[PDB]
Design a binder for this molecule. Structure first.
Ligand SMILES: Cc1[nH+]cc(COP(=O)(O)O)c(/C=N/C(CC(=O)O)C(=O)O)c1O
Ligand SMILES: Cc1[nH+]cc(COP(=O)(O)O)c(/C=N/C(CC(=O)O)C(=O)O)c1O
Lengths: 401, 401
């Protein structure tokens, strides 16, 4: 009878745990399609070209390793806001925002959730869409907020349930908090259409809800950054002051470096100052100050003209390749002789495909084929290469035949 | 009347804020002695030699940037435990521990505090020593625990108040939590003597308190790592299962990289497994996974024989230099003609000196001399160089004369 005799065996993460299990398999044909991690055409981890150069520049300058301010590297912070907001933005121009370096997308999301728990005096409820990324639940839950839901996906039709979305949203009590995915909804891969977004704007405005945007995929939904930041920007110019979280984990392939940011759109630059003051005070007793490596790299990329442009060609290429795997998947499916309609695969955007397979099929997939994916039918098509798209298709077919 | 009109201007950090103010001064003779950051003999930031080499090795191998497990880089984790515990340790040998990468010392401390808040069913009180590092308060406080105190320093005598310490400790209710600094107490620079430590052990054992060790300075108290880990190790071999937090920020000069670790000494290796399981689940909705750069560097250093030995000569050198600045400070003081007894300066160990100056003197120091330090009289003697020890001494003298 020690201190921890009562502490039970908790279970492995529904997403991250997939990597653990996959690591242990001895099947040489094994594929890891759980976590959304981009792979090159050879099925290998990919460090962008522009990253490798930023690194080299950092190297040559012999930089120190001194602590960074509590709010992060200034230049990285100003650059992320600019990247979300667009340079011509009044909010940006006018200085009505505060952006603070965060521990990637998760980190930022949690700093924001914590901030809210502490200063958002009007409500303890966060409305997530059905379905949403597994991690959103616990991030909000450990921060001290309550979780709610709004209809989103319609599995019958493999699409956005606009009517239910609007119904639900039109009834959320005023002054509540709503989480919206900026683009490339995870895990459905289905986004609202522009016109649809204009409509959502109205209701949010109308009901006076705090819009919380999660932007983990800028440049992966269409291959264009500005285009992918459309909705977010439209909300702001309609007069909706949102809170926003950013990740550079996927779009810059900086996964383990942990670079990201959390932003608040305020009334003036004076309000922005006070908010800043309080966010610092939250972060201090959390981790004191943030990791410098991913922030140093990103800043250099974003702030260096040639590096920025190279990066944009690189994002396009990754997005394109994903499209090619989608196409090929479907086609092989037919070739294998599938009866089913696999149109959703090519219809969805981003890193994944919300396939539809049941959990018994997921089980067989891993066991007979050593293909690892999440139990909800989600697969990371980003981790598929030209050499194993055939293998994938064949399996999908066998277990579905 | 927006969302954040009620959010007030919070104040700057008592320690980190010193750097902000110092940055803004235009006096060319300015010195930053607030935060404990080591400076070379030229008053410049110092990236150890072994760090620069680890980096190069990382570079050449073309490593990826894939996400790391939720618990961190295995090799870094096993190596930190080994570093605290000593290779011959039964706890280490027997596998009764769990170590998890954390966001430096602060990060680890907070993961531990959070763990405790969640699983330490016997008490909500943490006993800090008087005085203790400013940040300990809020880290424990935001995690959800209550703060208590035990006598420690005696400003009359510039030393450890052993009698008060023991009194206080002998009365802490059983099953409470006590925070002890492993070595180089911050900010007093005064540690218990070995015999004193044996005595403390007994009472802790005796009262059945959870000992929480904060080890931010291994190798800075004496210049020897094993020697500096003595107390921690003695507690464990007496049968006290402690929780421990480590930072590699100072001893390896990895400040902004954010490398650190949190460890739990359990009953068996099976308990260790369950604890692990639960810690992962806490970290997941916090920041998902930890930064890789500082962990990659440290692992290489610790796990590579020649690198490890070089590192140990390097720690010795830094510790030695500090000693030389102490000596010189005192001596110049006399030369300037101080009447006061500045013996505490050479008596204390570690990065600082708990000088004794009052806040009016601290004020003048910054204003007439541009010498920045914390308001409690603490100065970072580590940030002093041969070229400005005279300048420092003279000021100290003027404002004290
Ligand atoms: C919507 C969303 N938000 C935040 C994140 C967190 O990213 P990061 O910067 O690494 O903390 C991710 C990552 N998505 C996945 C990775 C994961 O589960 O950690 C995924 O679905 O695989 C998201 O898909
Ligand atoms: C006792 C102690 N514990 C934990 C830490 C945190 O270290 P890190 O790995 O950077 O989170 C520090 C740093 N000490 C100082 C730095 C600070 O205040 O952030 C100091 O007293 O200057 C400590 O002195």
């Amino acid at each position: 009878s020690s201190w921890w005799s009562h502490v039970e065996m908790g279970p492995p993460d529904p997403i991250l745990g997939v990597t653990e299990a996959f690591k242990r398999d001895t099947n040489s044909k094994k594929m890891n399609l759980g976590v959304g991690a981009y792979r090159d055409d050879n099925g290998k981890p990919y460090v962008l070209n522009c990253v490798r150069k930023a690194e080299a520049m950092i190297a040559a300058k012999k930089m120190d390793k001194e602590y960074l301010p509590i709010a992060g590297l200034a230049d990285f912070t100003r650059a992320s806001a600019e990247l979300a907001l667009g340079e011509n933005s009044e909010a940006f121009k006018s200085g009505r925002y505060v952006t603070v370096q965060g521990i990637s997308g998760t980190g930022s999301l949690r700093v924001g959730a914590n901030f809210l728990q502490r200063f958002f005096k009007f409500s303890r409820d966060v409305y997530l869409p059905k379905p949403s990324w597994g991690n959103h639940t616990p991030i909000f839950r450990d921060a001290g907020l309550q979780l709610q839901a709004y209809r989103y996906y319609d599995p019958k039709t493999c699409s956005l349930d606009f009517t239910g979305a609007m119904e639900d949203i039109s009834k959320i009590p005023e002054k509540s908090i709503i989480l919206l995915h900026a683009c490339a909804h995870n895990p459905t891969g289905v986004d609202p259409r522009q016109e649809q977004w204009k409509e959502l704007a109205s209701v949010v405005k109308k009901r006076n809800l705090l819009a919380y945007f999660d932007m983990a995929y800028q440049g992966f939904a269409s291959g264009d950054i500005n285009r992918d930041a459309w909705a977010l920007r439209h909300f702001i110019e309609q007069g909706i002051d949102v809170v926003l979280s950013q990740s550079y984990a996927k779009n810059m392939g900086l996964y383990g470096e942990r670079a990201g940011a959390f932003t608040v759109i305020c009334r003036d630059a004076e309000e922005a100052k006070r908010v800043e003051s309080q966010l610092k005070i939250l972060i201090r007793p959390m981790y004191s100050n943030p990791p410098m490596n991913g922030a140093r790299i990103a800043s250099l990329i974003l702030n260096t003209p040639e590096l920025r442009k190279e990066w944009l060609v690189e994002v396009k290429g990754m997005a394109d390749r994903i499209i090619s795997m989608r196409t090929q998947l479907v086609s092989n499916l037919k070739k294998e002789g599938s009866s089913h309609n696999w149109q959703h695969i090519t219809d969805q955007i981003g890193m994944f495909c919300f396939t539809g397979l049941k959990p018994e099929q997921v089980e067989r997939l891993t066991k007979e084929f050593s293909i690892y994916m999440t139990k909800d039918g989600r697969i990371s098509v980003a981790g598929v290469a030209s050499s194993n798209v055939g293998y994938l298709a064949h399996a999908i077919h066998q277990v579905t035949k």
